[PDB]
Coordinates of all heavy atoms in Angstrom, one line a residue:
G1 N 0.8 -1.2 0.0 CA 0.0 0.0 0.0 C 0.8 1.3 0.0 O 0.3 2.4 0.1
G2 N 2.1 1.1 -0.1 CA 3.0 2.2 -0.4 C 2.9 2.6 -1.8 O 2.0 2.1 -2.5
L3 N 3.8 3.4 -2.3 CA 4.0 3.6 -3.7 C 5.5 3.3 -4.0 O 6.3 3.5 -3.2 CB 3.7 5.0 -4.2 CG 2.3 5.5 -3.9 CD1 2.3 7.0 -4.1 CD2 1.3 4.8 -4.9
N4 N 5.8 2.8 -5.2 CA 7.1 2.8 -5.7 C 7.3 4.0 -6.5 O 6.4 4.5 -7.2 CB 7.3 1.6 -6.6 CG 7.6 0.3 -5.8 OD1 8.4 0.3 -4.9 ND2 6.8 -0.7 -6.1
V5 N 8.5 4.6 -6.5 CA 8.8 5.9 -7.1 C 10.0 5.6 -8.0 O 11.0 5.1 -7.5 CB 9.1 7.0 -6.1 CG1 9.4 8.3 -6.8 CG2 7.9 7.2 -5.1
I6 N 10.0 6.0 -9.2 CA 11.1 6.0 -10.1 C 11.4 7.4 -10.7 O 10.8 7.8 -11.6 CB 11.0 5.0 -11.3 CG1 10.3 3.7 -10.9 CG2 12.4 4.8 -11.9 CD1 11.1 2.8 -9.9
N7 N 12.4 8.1 -10.1 CA 12.8 9.4 -10.5 C 13.9 9.3 -11.6 O 14.9 8.7 -11.4 CB 13.3 10.3 -9.4 CG 12.6 10.0 -8.1 OD1 11.4 10.5 -7.9 ND2 13.2 9.2 -7.2
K8 N 13.6 9.9 -12.7 CA 14.5 9.8 -13.9 C 14.8 11.2 -14.4 O 14.0 12.1 -14.5 CB 13.8 9.0 -15.0 CG 14.7 8.1 -15.8 CD 13.9 7.3 -16.9 CE 13.8 8.0 -18.2 NZ 13.1 7.2 -19.3
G9 N 16.1 11.4 -14.7 CA 16.6 12.7 -15.2 C 17.8 12.6 -16.1 O 18.8 11.9 -15.8
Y10 N 17.7 13.3 -17.2 CA 18.8 13.4 -18.2 C 19.9 14.2 -17.6 O 19.6 15.3 -17.0 CB 18.3 14.0 -19.5 CG 19.3 14.1 -20.7 CD1 19.8 13.0 -21.3 CD2 19.6 15.4 -21.2 CE1 20.7 13.1 -22.3 CE2 20.5 15.5 -22.3 CZ 21.0 14.4 -22.8 OH 21.9 14.5 -23.9
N11 N 21.1 13.8 -17.7 CA 22.2 14.7 -17.4 C 22.6 15.3 -18.7 O 23.2 14.7 -19.6 CB 23.4 13.9 -16.8 CG 24.3 14.8 -15.9 OD1 24.8 15.8 -16.4 ND2 24.5 14.4 -14.7
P12 N 22.3 16.6 -18.9 CA 22.5 17.3 -20.2 C 24.0 17.5 -20.4 O 24.4 17.6 -21.6 CB 21.7 18.6 -20.0 CG 21.6 18.9 -18.5 CD 21.9 17.6 -17.8
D13 N 24.7 17.7 -19.3 CA 26.1 17.9 -19.4 C 27.0 16.7 -19.4 O 28.0 16.6 -20.1 CB 26.6 18.9 -18.3 CG 26.3 20.3 -18.6 OD1 26.3 20.7 -19.7 OD2 26.2 21.1 -17.6
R14 N 26.5 15.6 -18.7 CA 27.2 14.3 -18.7 C 26.7 13.3 -19.7 O 27.1 12.2 -19.7 CB 27.2 13.7 -17.3 CG 28.2 14.2 -16.3 CD 27.7 15.4 -15.5 NE 28.8 16.1 -14.7 CZ 28.6 16.9 -13.7 NH1 27.3 17.1 -13.2 NH2 29.6 17.4 -13.0
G15 N 25.9 13.8 -20.6 CA 25.3 13.0 -21.7 C 24.9 11.6 -21.3 O 25.2 10.6 -21.9
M16 N 24.0 11.6 -20.2 CA 23.7 10.4 -19.5 C 22.3 10.5 -18.9 O 21.7 11.6 -18.8 CB 24.7 10.3 -18.3 CG 25.8 9.3 -18.5 SD 25.4 7.6 -18.0 CE 25.2 7.8 -16.2
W17 N 21.7 9.3 -18.6 CA 20.5 9.3 -17.8 C 20.8 8.7 -16.5 O 21.4 7.6 -16.4 CB 19.4 8.4 -18.5 CG 18.8 9.1 -19.8 CD1 19.2 9.0 -21.0 CD2 17.7 10.0 -19.8 NE1 18.5 9.8 -21.9 CE2 17.5 10.4 -21.1 CE3 16.8 10.5 -18.8 CZ2 16.5 11.3 -21.5 CZ3 15.8 11.4 -19.2 CH2 15.6 11.8 -20.5
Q18 N 20.4 9.4 -15.4 CA 20.5 8.8 -14.1 C 19.1 8.6 -13.5 O 18.2 9.2 -13.9 CB 21.3 9.8 -13.2 CG 22.3 10.7 -14.0 CD 23.7 10.7 -13.5 OE1 24.6 11.6 -13.8 NE2 24.1 9.7 -12.6
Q19 N 19.0 7.6 -12.6 CA 17.7 7.2 -12.0 C 17.9 6.4 -10.8 O 18.7 5.5 -10.7 CB 16.9 6.4 -13.1 CG 15.9 5.5 -12.5 CD 15.6 4.3 -13.4 OE1 15.2 4.5 -14.6 NE2 15.6 3.1 -12.9
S20 N 17.0 6.7 -9.8 CA 16.9 6.0 -8.5 C 15.5 5.4 -8.3 O 14.6 5.9 -9.0 CB 17.3 6.8 -7.3 OG 16.1 7.4 -6.8
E21 N 15.4 4.5 -7.4 CA 14.1 4.0 -7.0 C 13.9 4.3 -5.5 O 14.9 4.2 -4.7 CB 13.8 2.5 -7.3 CG 14.2 2.1 -8.7 CD 13.9 0.6 -8.9 OE1 12.9 0.1 -8.4 OE2 14.7 -0.1 -9.7
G22 N 12.7 4.5 -5.1 CA 12.4 4.6 -3.7 C 10.9 4.2 -3.5 O 10.3 3.7 -4.4
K23 N 10.4 4.3 -2.2 CA 9.1 4.0 -1.9 C 8.5 5.2 -1.2 O 9.2 6.1 -0.8 CB 9.0 2.7 -1.0 CG 10.0 1.6 -1.4 CD 10.0 0.5 -0.5 CE 10.8 -0.7 -1.0 NZ 10.8 -1.9 -0.1
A24 N 7.2 5.2 -1.0 CA 6.5 6.3 -0.2 C 5.3 5.8 0.5 O 4.5 4.9 0.0 CB 6.1 7.5 -1.1
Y25 N 5.0 6.3 1.7 CA 4.0 5.7 2.5 C 3.2 6.8 3.2 O 3.7 7.8 3.7 CB 4.6 4.8 3.6 CG 5.3 3.6 3.1 CD1 6.7 3.7 2.9 CD2 4.7 2.4 2.8 CE1 7.4 2.6 2.4 CE2 5.4 1.3 2.4 CZ 6.8 1.4 2.1 OH 7.5 0.3 1.7

């Protein structure tokens, strides 16, 4: 009954995609 969270962000300077996962309650 939590949520899973996937935050995703382009690194415009590092020519990369970075991403983490977390949960929320």
